[PDB]
Fold this protein.
Amino acid sequence: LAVGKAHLEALLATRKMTLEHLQDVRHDATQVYFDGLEHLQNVAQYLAIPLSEFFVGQTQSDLDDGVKIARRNGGFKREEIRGGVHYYTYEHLVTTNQDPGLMALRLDLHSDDSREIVYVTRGAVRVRWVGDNDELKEDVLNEGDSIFILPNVPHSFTNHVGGAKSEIIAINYG
Amino acid sequence: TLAVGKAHLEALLATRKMTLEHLQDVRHDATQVYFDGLEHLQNVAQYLAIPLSEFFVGQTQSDLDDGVKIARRNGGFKREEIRGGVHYYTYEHLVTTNQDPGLMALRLDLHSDDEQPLRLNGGHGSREIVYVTRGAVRVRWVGDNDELKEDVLNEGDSIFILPNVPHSFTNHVGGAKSEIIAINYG
Amino acid sequence: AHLEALLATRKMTLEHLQNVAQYLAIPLSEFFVGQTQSDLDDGVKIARRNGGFKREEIRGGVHYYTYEHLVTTNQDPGLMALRLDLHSDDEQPLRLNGGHGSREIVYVTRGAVRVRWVGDNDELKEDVLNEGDSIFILPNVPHSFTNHVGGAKSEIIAINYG
Amino acid sequence: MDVRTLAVGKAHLEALLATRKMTLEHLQDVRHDATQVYFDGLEHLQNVAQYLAIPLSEFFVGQTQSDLDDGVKIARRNGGFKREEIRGGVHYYTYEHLVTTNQDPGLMALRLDLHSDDEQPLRLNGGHGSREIVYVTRGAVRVRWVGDNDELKEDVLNEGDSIFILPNVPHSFTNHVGGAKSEIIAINYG
Ligand SMILES: C[C@@H](O)CP(=O)(O)O
Ligand SMILES: C[C@@H](O)CP(=O)(O)O
Ligand SMILES: [Fe+3]
Ligand SMILES: [Fe+3]
Ligand SMILES: [Fe+3]
């Protein structure tokens, strides 16, 4: 395995160490080499550092000058059909490796059966969620309406009336 | 008179291995502790080695009903943005909550185009994601090399913007008014 | 200055207006973030022995702890450093705390310390820490520090943080 | 053992895929058992990471087994890492690790011996990102630090005294007397 040397000796700095205190690890020119993940994990144990930290910032950014652009129907797109019933049409919006917590989706609602924000781009949307004391709460969101949802709140979005196809923008973040 | 949550103030004192008995000149009921002016509250802040803000952290009542906040179209704040004498945006707040003050969701009407001069913002510390709902949108942002970058987003396209990146959204076609959804978050 | 920065996040200015906090959908605490002046002397705060808060802890009529604040700063209200004198041993009954939301690390500066805590399955776990030994404790873990020998008063440093 | 293979927690990976409305089937070239998903080298894992628009570090987040025993970790004197510190041909510190846990890698607790004094030239550090608090357990400690606008400030800390240090503030601890060797406790965190 290959690890960014400048980053590794930055991690070693937090433990008041250098490349010296690593047992037989080949290195030269801003690169440190481990023979196997089990080897790196043993180094991870020794430094009392989780394995994930050794890759932090090692992935090349997918941004173009601090910006990433996605196109309609450009990324992942899927249909959700369970039991012959057409429910959703999933589509990824712009996703970046600079914020894995960010998940943006465009949803075409067809059927009548992390923090999150949801905006209704078209049609009437029927929203359910479990309030406190396990009370079944429901409401109808129309075009222009938006909703904020606290983490760990059971909720579902569907088409209000049926026949008419609705569309929402769902953003999950941190 | 200044009020501070009793349970929260006791929790603060608990960490410092203190109780309300270790605070002087303080009135209190079951829910709150009372101070004689902010000058009194400043002395106590000094005594506990604590910023004045900590007395009110988590003491704001939630605006969710419940765990959920719903906004209606044109239900919130709304204004026009004029930069350098140029009509640029038409801000409309989406749903806002005090459970996440770092979240700013907006619907914008673009009014400027290529026949108007460029008016970049200073950017913001908020991560931003923008979705185009209508029309064609010209986006310009300042790259790493201090140089200007540009692109065009059509209906359905989206863009992610790193914090503190100066940017501008205008109409690709002069005259035609486009619409976007701008979501700022932590 | 700070208010105009808070208003800027809502795309507002001073002439668009503590019910204000409710209207701006902003917690009351955020309007004070940064108002208190730093107590640091050029990025540093120094505290002397027996200078700050000092208290004796007597639980159930038995002398257990002697709390003494180390350096405290308004630049980190989550930091709580204490020097403790241990006065109780195992001939006096065991009295655990309720734990706390802060991560904690303790260092034995003198003597021998008997540490008890509630681990898995609500089981009472025990061990002994000598001078130079240390212990990390997860948040909300009920624990207790007493003398191992008894009479031989020990001393520890306990740091609480984020 | 196969050194080329990279193992990833199956439940964790599936959780990541679930957020992006995906299942394991949308990844073709992967073997897996009940507990883990296997990749043919780091080259393969980087392809899947880019496709998922997910940084390489996220595949291992929360997957490290805890070194705690019953929510507690105990260290002994001379039981862990121990190192000498010479900065400019000048013997300065003797680093000794206190208890270190992977449940808080930002927590670096040290017991230090002071070897330098007024006879030796000053050797400040460049400061660090971690907040720090120091407690004097023995001797008299001379502390120097770079204040605001690059002014040199000094003070003396005796047994029982403490000091808080803001992140990225250059500092140095030496023996006040000169000859007598002092001891301190340094706690770096978040
Ligand atoms: C200082 C700490 O470790 C013991 P307690 O004061 O929380 O009971
Ligand atoms: C005690 C501590 O300040 C030494 P260093 O952090 O400069 O290495
Ligand atoms: Fe903006
Ligand atoms: Fe404690
Ligand atoms: Fe330091």
About this structure: The longest strand of chain B covers residues 86-93. The domain at 65-186 of chain B is CATH 2.60.120.10 (Jelly Rolls).
